Symmetry: D2
Subunit: 466 residues, 4 copies
Amino acid sequence: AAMEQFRQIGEVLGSLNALMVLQDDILINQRQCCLLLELFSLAFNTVAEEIRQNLKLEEKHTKWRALEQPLRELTRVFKEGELYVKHCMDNSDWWGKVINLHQNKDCVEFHIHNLFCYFSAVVEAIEAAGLDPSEMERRRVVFSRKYDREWNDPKMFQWRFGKQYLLSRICSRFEHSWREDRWNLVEALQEKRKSDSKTEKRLADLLLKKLTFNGKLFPSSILLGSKDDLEPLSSEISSLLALCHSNILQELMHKDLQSYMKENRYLFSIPVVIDIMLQIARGMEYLHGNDIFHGDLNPMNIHLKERSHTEGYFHAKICGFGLSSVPVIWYAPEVLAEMKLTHKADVYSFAMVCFELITGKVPFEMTINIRMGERPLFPFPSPKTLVSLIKRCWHSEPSQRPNFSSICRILRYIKKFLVVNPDHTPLVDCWDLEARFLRKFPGSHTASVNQIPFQLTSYRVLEKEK
Amino acid sequence: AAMEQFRQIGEVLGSLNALMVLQDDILINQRQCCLLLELFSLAFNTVAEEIRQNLKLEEKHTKWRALEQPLRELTRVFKEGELYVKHCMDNSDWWGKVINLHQNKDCVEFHIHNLFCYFSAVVEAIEAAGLDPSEMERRRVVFSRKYDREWNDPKMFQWRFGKQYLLSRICSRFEHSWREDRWNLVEALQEKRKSDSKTEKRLADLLLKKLTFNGKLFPSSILLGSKDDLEPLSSEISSLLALCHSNILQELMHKDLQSYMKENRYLFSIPVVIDIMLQIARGMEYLHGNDIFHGDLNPMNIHLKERSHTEGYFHAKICGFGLSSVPVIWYAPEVLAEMKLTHKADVYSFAMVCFELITGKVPFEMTINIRMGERPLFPFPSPKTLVSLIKRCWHSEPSQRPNFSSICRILRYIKKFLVVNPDHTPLVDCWDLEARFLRKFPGSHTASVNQIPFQLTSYRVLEKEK
Amino acid sequence: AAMEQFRQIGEVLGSLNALMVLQDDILINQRQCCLLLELFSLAFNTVAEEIRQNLKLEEKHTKWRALEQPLRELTRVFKEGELYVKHCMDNSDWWGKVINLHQNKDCVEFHIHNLFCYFSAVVEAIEAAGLDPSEMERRRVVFSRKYDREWNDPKMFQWRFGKQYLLSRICSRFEHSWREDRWNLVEALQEKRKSDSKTEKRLADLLLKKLTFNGKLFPSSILLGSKDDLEPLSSEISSLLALCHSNILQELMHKDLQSYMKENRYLFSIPVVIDIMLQIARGMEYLHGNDIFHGDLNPMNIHLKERSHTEGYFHAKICGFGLSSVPVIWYAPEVLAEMKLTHKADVYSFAMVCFELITGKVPFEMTINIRMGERPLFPFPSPKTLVSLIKRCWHSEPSQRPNFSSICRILRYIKKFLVVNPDHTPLVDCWDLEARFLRKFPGSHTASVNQIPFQLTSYRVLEKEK
Amino acid sequence: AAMEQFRQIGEVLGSLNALMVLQDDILINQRQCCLLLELFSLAFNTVAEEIRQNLKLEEKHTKWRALEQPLRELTRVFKEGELYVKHCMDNSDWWGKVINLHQNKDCVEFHIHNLFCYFSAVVEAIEAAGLDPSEMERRRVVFSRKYDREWNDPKMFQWRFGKQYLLSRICSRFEHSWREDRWNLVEALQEKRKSDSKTEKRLADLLLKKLTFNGKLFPSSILLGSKDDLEPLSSEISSLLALCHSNILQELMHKDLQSYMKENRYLFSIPVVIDIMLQIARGMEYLHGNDIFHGDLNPMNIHLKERSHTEGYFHAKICGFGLSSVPVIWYAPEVLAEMKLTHKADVYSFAMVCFELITGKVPFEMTINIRMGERPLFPFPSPKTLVSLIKRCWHSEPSQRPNFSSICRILRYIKKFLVVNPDHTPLVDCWDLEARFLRKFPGSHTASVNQIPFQLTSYRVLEKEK
């Protein structure tokens, strides 16, 4: 039930607030998770406010039916966030907790990332207008002018709708949180190491130095080894230690993708297939945030996991990109020419990975044909939206295949469209719309979460213009 | 789990707040239920604050175990309150909703009554002290002085602990709420009747007049009669219309007690038996709040119900007290002398009713013996606390049996003691303690909910003195 | 200084809040003045917010210069409100305080009335745009579309700008405040009269009955008479007791107008002249709110006063309208025909009164000429805006002269225009603009303060269309 | 007037809040001054709350007279704080503003230091009890038990009164503020230097490095010299750069003391004399916070200033302590033995300085006599409290003269006593009381502002025991 789903948001947010009110016991977050609490409270309050202002609270079972899917996805993301706060509140091996936790976590930004990617289902809250016969027209034209061509700009948007889509002037707050946690952590570490009163202190010093290169000093971590790096060269390749993102195994992957594939008979919905694609992308171009190139990408290198209380949703990272010291059908066509670590080239692998996910079948029932450009074809059952995006990347020229920034946002747009329509036409081929946003407005090596409300809207605006 | 129970409070309160944020659609409350939301938020916030201040958030599974039962009862009462808010938010027969709802409801005060009767399980939050060895003594003596003999006074208490036990200077707020609802209601009724545009309006006028005697004008209520008052005399007996309390069927009783008895083999725990007793008392002396005397009380006149999401708890009212126009073993011994509507006499019936509830067996396997004073005796299995209270009332002299005020509060004290100790000695015979509070401090025709924090504490103070 | 004026708002509001935090001692308001505190805090917070959002806090002395006059008038009204709260907080003759105070006060609504009439100098806060050269155009066109022809509607406005111009859904809150004060008052009166323990109680009963006709029972008010009603007939003429407004002497007028005139050599600025006119109008048509007609209006019947900390501003009421039991140059031309208590006729007197105020000279250096329609002419020094309004009313036909509703709002529009422009062309003759608002939208026996934001805006919108 | 003084607090706090609501324009504070706003709002709210709870708002002119002096001093400190926020909000030479401002400012902690030193005039708010005759005794004994001997402990106090004397668990908040300002500053500096687009950037790099030793690189600061360090040795003596306190000229002293003396005929009240003493002490032992010893102290080295809107109050620093590369009557008696940079020795100079301040006359109308121990004697007019403290320090043994920690707090106790009693016996010689606090509880190289509520109370407790 629609309104009932809202009460679920209330329940989850109350749970979060109850857990958080006993705050000062945390020694890692309480400056990250506090941001989560504030953002979630703001989101709930603003969706409640806009409901109260633009709906009428009598037709609880007749003319709210459109609200179901978006609010359900919202309870999912809220639940996901609360569970992260829980795992950060656990009392389990404080030292191992420090290690596993944020030196390089950013799970808070990942969660708010999903929150943003789905909050733009405020477009639902706008379906209340669709009592008074003349009024309906007023609301329609109001929203129409809210979607006018002259409204496409970071400044103009961020000023005319900042408070409707959660953007304050606390856009820069996220980074301050990412910082004060660090200093509380090092203060606690110094307190521990100098107020020690075996070998725990030694780690602290090694650990404290990292937050102050490549320490990697001692086997002091005796490393009691369960089931399952050769020379002191390429030391500078240890920067890896400064590539933090919740889509990159900085610690351990539960299982990989190719493993999860061969016994997969469909387990991936268009609504987890698209997601499984995005967590890669959202995480991919952060590599280019330091210009590092994965080079070889394969389902043997994408470590998925389980999303807890979700309908099969998984959080995936990417492993093996680092470590450049030591079948080819997963290589790029241009990297067939060895007879190739272009930023552009990696898309062929990304596309190739998605090729499996959609179909669930590995490419081919030949290498020379790949250079020519002939490519395997997906089945009739596969949907129109997914197929168009992969094929465009599929083209042989390396420049004509789109970068990750040019491919992440368009995926998340598909997400918003799906969440808006539980049933099943897609608007248009997605690629054409992106070019517009890419075409003029563009001119961005890395993108942060603040841009999501704008990017999501621009397509809504751009799409109307056609 | 203790802390887990708290998260349940968070969930319930979030549910309530989500339902309430869509407020203005209500046409009966939104000045009563708003009081509920404010009080519940204050209760949650203050228990959270005192937890954060007097506990330490690491021993989540070791030294909080004492918190379980009180917080569980708290989630019960919170749940009960949310469900009332729901029933008031329902969209079902707005006119019948107006009738059934508050002209004489007071369900808000009944709910806050239970909330007060159980919040004094803040004494649990004081068990955190029972890390630092010297500190434990400090907290013990602090609480000891919090329980000093020189602290027994409405003013001194209400000033030195008002904010710890929820009492503001919004003690008088409750009545203002009970009022503004009325005026919003009559304003909506006038709007409806004068903006009518069959016979709905006629009711309004009759209904509006009541809130402006005995209208009872017409059979305009055609009264489509399901399964199942003789002359125009004793018109003044219609005051009944001004006796409002959520423990008195002002509209219909689902089932009575004697009905629920004969097939009852125990269904009543000491923790619902005591409660079933109290809802009577809490509701009994409100009759004396207008000096009306029930006279004849029998399980054939106590209409119990179901408490929804509770462990068999029921909300009961009293029916047949009014209507004075038209076996004796349920009569008082002094009203054996007919060969008798004393306020004192009714206790014999109340006691007699409780006599069944404890034992579950009707008195006797004789009337002359009752005048003499011989009385039936309860079995060995029955607990010590319940037996002492009934027997004292049982005594033949009508003056030596205690009034309802003198018997309600002592029952609720047993409630607090039980909630504090899930296992199973009782402190002392309860009657001795009441006499002390009754003995000097007393000097009270009616009592309101504000007095509950004080009354509950006084026994804790009085009991220590012994 | 512009920003400095804002700090003055801060100072005044802090003063108000400090006085109000010691609230419960008040026995008349604390439900009226509390509304004042809430409204003023909201006004300050929202002007601060919109400043922070649409200005840049560096050009504190260069590009804020336009903000001076509106914010200065704002500190005036805030100061006026605080002083009212003071007079209500005074400890002076609690009984006389009750009498003089709200049985029929409405000073709270009068204050918020001025607050609304001047807050629409938010148009100033919009002058910040007038750093980035392209941006200025964006803000200009944004505001332009904020002033589009398709935006003229109570619903559409009250929904699309309610929070920018203070209108909540607490528009109806004002009346609830006007009510709960009454009931706190009667509760205190009952407490006093029944807990009396000479003749003070007798008044209470007489006073309590009025709030429960024409009591006017006894000379119990011995009436110790200072310097300075004949028979028991026309009893029904005592309704006067139900005509409450802060522009009508319900208790005593310090001085009248004609008195203040002959020695007045200009004391009335266009900015107090217009105001002196409005307080009449705002107060005039409330008479028609019960259809009562003043009939004869003269500067010998307008009791002005002093506005405390203001630049000569005065609060005026109207006396002698009631009492219908027992030179003509102040009579209407049609009431020359006696050889006449039309609602329309009174305008001639109102206009005639304004005729003095502008010029400061009584009409004429003749009665037959007045019937013909010849009228005295104001001097060249008098401004264009004031002259156009009086002359239109001046016309002989009684129907073609505008009603008070049709003349109050247009005056207050002149107020907003003046406050917006300290220097000195007027936009257009004011009368033409009103006809538009009057022409279709109209279809209003009485108007309340909630309509002011809309009415003020409509002219801004209507004026652009021309 | 007492209550009127409160309204002044309201005015000042409103001024502060109005200035602060336009926050993000600040590029130095907005993490320091924000702490000021929060603390001041908390202080105002809590004094208002305790007034409302323990006073009665009718005797506004009779039984509040005791509140005058403490609340007046409070408006002073609030005003002082607002003016600091102003100077930090000024738009004057952003670069010079950065230099002069907090690299080593701590003015926020200095202001809150005065706020704490005077808030313990909450003891006034306790004078309301001194209507009901029996009640007065209740309040007296309540406060008595609030001052029981068993209550002397950091934990017990900080837990049983933390919220009454402003101490949260935001005691550690102060340091976080002192930090985030730094990082916002370096972020803005990096933004400026890398987005430069003459020689301003060079400074930034030098400046940025300091916040990352002794740079002191270039005369790039051309140093346009007004009216009015020899070799590259003792480089390590540049630590001075890490000795930050608002009582130590880190930049320029307006005037010194000896200058201000010879024409001073009294200008120093016991209420600015004591203060002038304290700002030294509060600032003195921070030198021992890095063990540095001033060695030679003279009115030729104490640079006083003007306290703006205060009654002659001045903020003084200490200059010349650093720079150890290159009449004796101001030297310590033991440093007469040269025929001496003890931490103990400096007191003789401090005492000697105070000796002037009290009397206003330099010591003597002889050196050999000083070794013997004969000392100049102050006049009969000088008060008893000041004389006892200086004389004890005056004793010849260097160990028997008290350290700064042992002498700062006792001075501030005199402050509280004076503020509590505008008229004029002192309680006892102050020195005896300190020994008690010093005697057991002590066991503190440096003390921070958090300790002030406790230290101030302990004397109140200790003094009662006698």
